[PDB]
Design an enzyme around this catalytic site. Structure first.
Site, PDB file in Angstrom:
ATOM      1  N   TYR A 117       0.825  -1.205   0.000  1.00  0.00           N
ATOM      2  CA  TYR A 117       0.000   0.000   0.000  1.00  0.00           C
ATOM      3  C   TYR A 117       0.863   1.262   0.000  1.00  0.00           C
ATOM      4  O   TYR A 117       1.772   1.394   0.819  1.00  0.00           O
ATOM      5  CB  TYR A 117      -0.896  -0.004   1.241  1.00  0.00           C
ATOM      6  CG  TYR A 117      -1.855   1.158   1.331  1.00  0.00           C
ATOM      7  CD1 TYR A 117      -3.033   1.173   0.585  1.00  0.00           C
ATOM      8  CD2 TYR A 117      -1.590   2.240   2.172  1.00  0.00           C
ATOM      9  CE1 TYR A 117      -3.929   2.237   0.678  1.00  0.00           C
ATOM     10  CE2 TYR A 117      -2.478   3.312   2.272  1.00  0.00           C
ATOM     11  CZ  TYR A 117      -3.645   3.301   1.522  1.00  0.00           C
ATOM     12  OH  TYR A 117      -4.530   4.347   1.620  1.00  0.00           O
TER      13      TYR A 117
ATOM     14  N   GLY B 194      -6.719   4.392  -0.299  1.00  0.00           N
ATOM     15  CA  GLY B 194      -8.111   4.115   0.014  1.00  0.00           C
ATOM     16  C   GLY B 194      -8.704   3.077  -0.918  1.00  0.00           C
ATOM     17  O   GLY B 194      -8.059   2.062  -1.206  1.00  0.00           O
TER      18      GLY B 194
HETATM   19  O1  LIG Z   1      -6.457   3.006   4.462  1.00  0.00           O
HETATM   20  C1  LIG Z   1      -7.439   3.229   3.724  1.00  0.00           C
HETATM   21  O2  LIG Z   1      -7.998   2.304   3.089  1.00  0.00           O
HETATM   22  C2  LIG Z   1      -7.978   4.605   3.573  1.00  0.00           C
HETATM   23  C3  LIG Z   1      -7.173   5.639   3.278  1.00  0.00           C
HETATM   24  C4  LIG Z   1      -7.625   7.053   3.059  1.00  0.00           C
HETATM   25  C5  LIG Z   1      -6.634   8.026   2.717  1.00  0.00           C
HETATM   26  C6  LIG Z   1      -7.001   9.372   2.492  1.00  0.00           C
HETATM   27  C7  LIG Z   1      -8.358   9.777   2.603  1.00  0.00           C
HETATM   28  O3  LIG Z   1      -8.697  11.080   2.383  1.00  0.00           O
HETATM   29  C8  LIG Z   1      -9.355   8.822   2.943  1.00  0.00           C
HETATM   30  C9  LIG Z   1      -8.985   7.469   3.171  1.00  0.00           C
END
Ligand SMILES: O=C(O)/C=C/c1ccc(O)cc1
Ligand SMILES: O=C(O)/C=C/c1ccc(O)cc1
Lengths: 514, 514, 513
Positions: free
Chosen positions: B54, B61
């Site tokens: 990741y 996300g």
């Molecule tokens: O870890 C995740 O799946 C989500 C990450 C995430 C990173 C930036 C954002 O604005 C919203 C969610």
């Protein structure tokens, strides 16, 4: 030049805000000037006759059983301003502090406060200048404390604020604004330190801000429909008539007008379609939209009716005499003692408006959540990004920020339910109306930020869906996006949006999309 | 000779605050430096081997399903910092912002983040400087947003704050602090934009403040007993032993120590007295004090136990690795993916402490209400005024202000219960820990203002009861009043107290009565 | 038994009369005609196979699945089935009936397509002494409780008799002389629709608040008679200076309550001219504490909130909150929208809940003052009789009133807790039903607080004015005498729990007249 508001007996919320924001100058009408001169004479007679009157011949609060000799009234009222100046916290903003001054003035203008010409003139001068007194926001249980601080400011013993919030010391304030130091020799101090001026001032600013935010909520819901092929039949006037809440009928009518001329929404009434055996199956989309679009008139409408009530009550309060004691114009009695200073009305309406604002902010937040979700936005890019997906996330951060702002709003509830017996049990019940109005203000500010995020998302969605030329977009929709693009560039690649969100939010609070 | 905190693996809350407040420099211990160098290498190997990780080979996300090629990683992480910078609202204060920086550093020091030496050096340099990054307080659902803003500041693309909160632009900050611009060329951006650093930083500052306010709560409760002839038998160790809550046992012991040497408190155990026939009747006073005195150990104790729980959880959080993804130091697998960034622990403890603070603030408020009430303060002047009664009202204004501050505290509830599905439903549950920490902080600030009022009242009450010489007052009590009188004069006549209340409050948050 | 003829409009009092069983209900000829016209329109819509939700489509997000005419009976039968997931205590008899009435009023407008038989079942229920047994929880605002209502009306769910005793479905139909509901006309959506549950709860809240408000005024007045309260603070002149309708009304009603009293202070203090010799500390201040002096302002704000609540509720009760809906004018075969979104009742219920909590706080502080020997101007501590110390009088009841208030305060507005649900189709919800129910609980608590205050005042009046109540106003005397018919004086400490509960029940249904 500059518009002028002539104060006699009644002033509406728009005039009030015009004066408080410095958009209009203020003048006391002759009839009011005379009523005040007459009341000034009654106060003098009351004092000469040594009448038993709170604040003129008695101590304050529970110490009112301590009578005061006429020779010490100057000292008594000077100490009143002193011991009440225990306020703390950030100062009320420029417009709000001025709105408080105006509220006190309107009450006095009714001619039952005994305020002297000089005293009234000092308030009018402040309102006509570009200054505002710097008064701490916390301290009152609902509004002697903030008003005592105001008195100190008007005497040059407290700071002033310019339109930008920059503080000036007392002397510099009187100088710059050409203000004369407040003189309470007439023993009319209770005309300044009395009533519900602070909460009423905060509430009138809240009323004006909500009107503008309500307009954006409508405009943005309409643009959302143009970005998601929303169905206009849910906004039909026929539906409003079946459930005739004024606020709803109005919201629906305003939504219909926003998308007038649009070729991006779906205008067909589904029930006109006759189905045959060949139509029985699973269709791509349901015949009605999700609630954030379909139920917009009902949600916004309920909020609008709450605001309407808030304003009706506030209009009465703003034009009332919340003073104690009071001197009856008819001369039936030398004075009357009661509790017209109990701000339970503004306290309850502010709490109600606060809840409505939180509900409406929730609608906008969910509208953002739907529009930016690739599984729900009907073909738009995830989080409305431009450039390669993955490398770019677009409004992904801004979307979570909107949720964070809403979650914070929800953490604070009504202020009115927290009355606590104080002042040696003499004030065994208090309104906390000033706190109520201030808490509502905060939610209004959060709502503006959430709406700002939605506006920026929609400007982007409109271009992604309809091209930079916004083909098919309604005239009103086009004007809104074009106006936004004058100051806010398209999101072609990821960039910090925090400052822009803050800047746009400030704008939304002061102007509507037209 | 500015103290130095050597960071290896563990750091306690006091050391953390010493660094955050600039009272101590921070240095990385040799073993920590080595663990980090090794982790840095592991991050290099993960990139070299093109491991599916990741933020290194994926979008963010829900967009993580879009895989990214090695040549576009610099851009990927650069856009990450960008799109996340949607924060708004007042910036975190100097100490809190630095505490956030420290929290991220301690996590990295465990050697599982992959941060490069340079990245670590930038954080250390910031902490050893007199500056703090200027980061918006709102935007996160719990802490990528505020941390992304931190990254921008450290690159010279964001403001900085000096100890006084005065803002400097990026360039000036790097210059004045003699800092090097942050370089993320090693693709270690996720070592900075990760975890629960913001809420943890805010919470550790809350922890320090509560320790001091707790000491004042005990000190003022003890002084109150000396002003009202309080009974010490309710604070006996025997009672603590019968109901062994650690916080209560400690509160009672600390209260006894405060009044040691006092001749103004009643130490006689009522049960020792044997009654005869001529005693039956109505005595002037009951054999037990009101709860604000008699139940102080139990009320303060529960609050202290809450703070102890909060601190145990916070200590684990501060010294943990809340990053995602993480690189196992034992080399078992290239990296692990989970949700250690979910700040539910700080969210729940912050909410619990906020409740405890509101409860303890209530105790202080009621102690003020009783002390200033002539019907309850056993012979003291109403509202502790000096000079002629009525003409002077003493602390009558401050007493109501204390009530208003408390009422406002009660209007805000727990933040944790408002989780809302966001990020296209990917973050279907969020902690809101940052918000919770901030709401707790505001309550702590109100508590300090309430304690300040109580302190000013008690200084006056002590002198009124025991004379300016404070005859019969315990050594601890004398020291506290004398210490206060060095900066706060007696109230011989009514005067504005707002500024003094605010000034004293600021002191109570950083120092205890010793 | 009086009869309420329902045509188009019905006021809150008529509604509660029917819901409470105090009045029969009859559908006026014009209404029956409009409904028959709507029934015919639904028939045509079905014959024409128009694309209409619930007639040719699945529900919620499943509406994209079109349904063939032969399967509509099953479709609507399953609708009632999957919606019956309600849980929790059943709505009380009066409230469940109020819900039935709310659905009927909506239908009577002639845009729901309900068949004559369906309408008859609702009218029959209301004219009987029964109420459907419906769980109070489950809806986000009111398909679930209405689905349960349908099952009950089909004899597949319990019924409640006036006492709340439950009867099984079959027994209910038999005892109430009700025929089983038949939805063969495919008019199920006429029953499972709108905001009937929250509206029914809210109208019961409205009625209860009017009575408690009357008690709050009557008890504030009697308090003045027990503590030598100053009437000048209730002067009409003050109301005129700050003209809030609720305040003017509160003040007027307060003055009326103490008319004829010799126990209150009527002198206007400003009439007194002071001399040098008078300067010093007098026994009492010239004004009363806020719980008396500011009663018009506190009660008034509460009354204006209730007035707003009632204005909005009257519109909701008389509206058509159905979806879909069939336009009487025939402009289009049917309209699809969201008139079922209960945001209006949600916001007004939450606002009223706050007002109720504020007014209960006033009553609680009035008890706290009246029972405090340091503040009640000469009355016994906690209004006890018999030897002091040995007797504590209302010392326990006073703390209980505080406990009740503190509990009220722990629950806030329900409307701010909207959560996207139904696979995000219902991404915003009103929670209006929850809002009205939470307001109802606060109303019940307020009644218990007022009951405690009333029992304290009856005792206080006798202690201050003797059993003969000398100098007490005609209204004050009548109120105490009425209470004393069922509640004996407290000559010696005794358990008050059951009496407090019994009186509270009375306060919610009747005013001091
Ligand atoms: O870890 C995740 O799946 C989500 C990450 C995430 C990173 C930036 C954002 O604005 C919203 C969610
Ligand atoms: O009118 C009253 O009885 C109360 C007056 C009051 C004046 C100043 C305070 O700080 C609190 C209460």
């Amino acid at each position: 030049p500059k518009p002028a508001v002539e104060l006699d007996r009644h002033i509406d919320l728009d005039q009030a805000h015009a004066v408080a924001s410095g958009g209009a100058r203020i003048v006391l009408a002759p009839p009011a000037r005379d009523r005040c001169r007459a009341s000034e004479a009654r106060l003098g007679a009351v004092i000469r006759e040594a009448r038993h009157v709170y604040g003129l011949t008695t101590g304050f609060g529970p110490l009112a059983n301590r009578l005061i000799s006429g020779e010490n009234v100057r000292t008594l009222q000077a100490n009143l301003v002193h011991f009440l100046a225990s306020g703390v916290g950030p100062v009320l903003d420029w417009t709000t502090a001025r709105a408080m001054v105006l509220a006190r003035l309107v009450s006095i203008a009714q001619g039952a406060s005994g305020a002297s010409e000089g005293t009234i003139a000092r308030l009018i001068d402040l309102l006509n200048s570009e200054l505002a007194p710097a008064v701490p926001s916390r301290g009152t249980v609902g509004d002697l404390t903030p008003l005592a601080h105001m008195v100190l400011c008007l005497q040059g013993r407290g700071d002033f604020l310019d339109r930008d919030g920059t503080r000036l010391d007392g002397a510099e304030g009187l100088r710059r604004g050409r203000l004369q130091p407040l003189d309470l020799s007439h023993r009319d101090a209770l005309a300044l330190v009395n009533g519900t001026s602070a909460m009423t001032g905060i509430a009138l600013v809240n009323a004006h801000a909500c009107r503008h935010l309500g307009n954006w909520a409508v405009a943005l819901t309409a643009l959302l429909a143009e970005c998601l092929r929303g169905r206009t039949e849910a906004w039909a006037a026929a539906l409003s008539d079946l459930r005739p809440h004024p606020g709803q009928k109005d919201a629906a009518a305003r939504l219909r007008a926003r998308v007038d001329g649009s070729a991006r929404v779906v205008r067909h009434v589904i029930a006109e379609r006759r189905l045959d055996a060949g139509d029985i199956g699973t269709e791509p989309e349901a015949g009605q939209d999700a609630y954030s679009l379909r139920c917009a008139p009902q949600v916004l409408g309920a909020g609008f009716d709450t605001l309407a009530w808030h304003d009706r009550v506030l209009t009465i309060e703003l034009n009332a005499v919340t003073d104690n004691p009071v001197f009856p114009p008819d001369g039936s009695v030398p004075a009357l003692h009661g509790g017209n200073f109990m701000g339970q009305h503004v306290a309850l309406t502010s709490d109600a408006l606060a809840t409505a604002v939180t509900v409406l902010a929730g609608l906008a937040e969910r509208q953002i959540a739907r529009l930016t979700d690739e599984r729900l936005n009907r073909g738009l890019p995830p989080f409305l990004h431009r450039g390669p997906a993955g490398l770019n996330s677009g409004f992904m951060g801004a979307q979570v920020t909107a949720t964070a702002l809403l979650a914070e709003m929800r953490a604070t509830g009504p202020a009115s339910i927290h009355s606590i017996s104080t002042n040696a049990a003499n004030q065994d019940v208090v309104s906390l109306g000033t706190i109520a109005a201030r808490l509502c203000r905060e939610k209004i500010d959060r709502w503006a930020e959430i709406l700002a995020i939605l506006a920026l998302c929609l400007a982007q969605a409109a271009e992604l869906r309809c091209g930079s030329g916004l083909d098919g977009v309604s005239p009103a929709g086009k004007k809104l996006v074009q106006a936004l693009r004058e100051q806010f560039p398209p999101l072609e690649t990821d960039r910090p949006l925090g400052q822009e969100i803050a800047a746009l939010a400030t704008h939304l609070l002061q102007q509507s999309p037209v």
